[PDB]
Amino acid sequence: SSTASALGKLQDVVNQNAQALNTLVKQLSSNFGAISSVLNDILSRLDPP
Amino acid sequence: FASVYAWNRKRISNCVADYSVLYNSASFSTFKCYGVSPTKLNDLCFTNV
Numbered sequence A: 001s002s003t004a005s006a007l008g009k010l011q012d013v014v015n016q017n018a019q020a021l022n023t024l025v026k027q028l029s030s031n032f033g034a035i036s037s038v039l040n041d042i043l044s045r046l047d048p049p
Numbered sequence B: 001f002a003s004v005y006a007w008n009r010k011r012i013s014n015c016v017a018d019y020s021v022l023y024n025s026a027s028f029s030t031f032k033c034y035g036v037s038p039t040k041l042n043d044l045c046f047t048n049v
Helices: A008-029 A037-047 B020-024 B038-043
Strands: none
Touching: A037 B038, B020 B038
């Protein structure tokens, strides 16, 4: 009841899953060498070739 | 028209521009666009031209 942080294993498992998912969803904001990180913009800007 | 070493710069803002007349006119020897498709110009909105 009083002492906290006695459940480190379950807590850190949850933290690991959440962190992996967050970095996966954050990876969507990278140019990867292209001109923009959003697909609709480059679709609407230039020629399909 | 000014010299190449003293190229004349003009700023265009707060206007409604029709780029089609530029593509329609045949008076231009070279009409080369790099970041955008020439036919999509009327479909976009910019600032500080």
